[PDB]
Amino acid sequence: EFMENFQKVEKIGEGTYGVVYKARNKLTGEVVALKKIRLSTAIREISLLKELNHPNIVKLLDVIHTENKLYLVFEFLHQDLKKFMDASALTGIPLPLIKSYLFQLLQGLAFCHSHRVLHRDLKPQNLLINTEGAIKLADFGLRTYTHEVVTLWYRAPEILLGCKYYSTAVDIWSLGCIFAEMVTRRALFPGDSEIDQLFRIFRTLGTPDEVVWPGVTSMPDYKPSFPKWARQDFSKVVPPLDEDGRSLLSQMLHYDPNKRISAKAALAHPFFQDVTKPVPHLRL
Numbered sequence: 689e690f691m692e693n694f695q696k697v698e699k700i701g702e703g704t705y706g707v708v709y710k711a712r713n714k715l716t717g718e719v720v721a722l723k724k725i726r727l728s729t730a731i732r733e734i735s736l737l738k739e740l741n742h743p744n745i746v747k748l749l750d751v752i753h754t755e756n757k758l759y760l761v762f763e764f765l766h767q768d769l770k771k772f773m774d775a776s777a778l779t780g781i782p783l784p785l786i787k788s789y790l791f792q793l794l795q796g797l798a799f800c801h802s803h804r805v806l807h808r809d810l811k812p813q814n815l816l817i818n819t820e821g822a823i824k825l826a827d828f829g830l831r832t833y834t835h836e837v838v839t840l841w842y843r844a845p846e847i848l849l850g851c852k853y854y855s856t857a858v859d860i861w862s863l864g865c866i867f868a869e870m871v872t873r874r875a876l877f878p879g880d881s882e883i884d885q886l887f888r889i890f891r892t893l894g895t896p897d898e899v900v901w902p903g904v905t906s907m908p909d910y911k912p913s914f915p916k917w918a919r920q921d922f923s924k925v926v927p928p929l930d931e932d933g934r935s936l937l938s939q940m941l942h943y944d945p946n947k948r949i950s951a952k953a954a955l956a957h958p959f960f961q962d963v964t965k966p967v968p969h970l971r972l
């Protein structure tokens with residue numbers, strides 16, 4: 689019944705919760721992204737997200753509950769960062785554009801974190817970009833319905849070690865992983881299981897201990913039998929990124945979530961002293 693309001697133009701995602709269509713509001717001709725989830729607590733919580741409006745958050749226009757389906761109607765953007773990263777792979781995204789995207793995402797996070805909203809599943813597939821140089825956070829997250837594996841590559845270590853309470857720091861870790869990936873053109877920690885993800889982190893950043901992360905050894909999934917890898921330098925991890933970028937990235941990848949840089953503090957980092965807003969070249 690609801691779909692009679694909307695012309696499905698094409699399928700754009702098999703999102704974490706459901707399928708997303710580009711669609712055209714049959715009466716207004718507004719073009720939107722429409723997410724169909726298959727099925728009260730959620731209705732109330734998701735309805736509150738209609739108020740979490742910011743230029744770097746994809747605008748949630750409406751939330752419809754009808755006939756054991758939840759539909760979410762969003763402002764439409766034309767592509768994700770994953771596709772831009774894959775397209776820019778031979779050449780690299782120019783540093784000023786990486787910088788601008790990071791700064792923008794940080795502004796978005798600072799906003800939602802100030803309102804005690806976490807994302808919990810940041811990844812290149814839910815960062816969306818336009819021709820005007822904007823990037824926006826989509827698909828806030830609290831197998832897929834198509835049985836596709838949900839990616840672990842940007843999961844913070846506290847999640848992987850079983851922490852029950854997430855803090856805003858989980859987002860900062862995800863974004864640091866994405867920043868590194870923009871710079872190097874390869875995923876930082878491409879785990880293909882929970883333990884493979886954790887051990888990739890450990891192999892690059894050192895196996896965490898009580899010195900760098902007090903309370904780590906008391907975590908639910910911590911095991912004394914984890915191998916003990918020494919830390920590597922960042923100069924090896926994200927060459928040829930400059931000192932300011934390296935320093936920022938190191939702070940976004942602190943193990944302790946209480947030491948990890950906040951979005952707000954990251955926006956003050958000297959890395960952004962010369963930030964600008966370049967226009968990407970998009971082929972739509």
Ligand SMILES: Cc1ncc(-c2ccnc(Nc3ccc(S(C)(=O)=O)cc3)n2)n1C(C)C
Pocket residue numbers: 700701702703704708721723746762763764765766767768769771813814815816826827
């Ligand atoms: C999970 C989710 N919920 C809402 C969206 C959403 C919201 C706004 N616009 C879009 N547009 C879009 C996404 C990806 C691509 S493509 C060709 O690069 O795959 C093309 C256009 N999508 N999404 C996205 C993240 C699928």
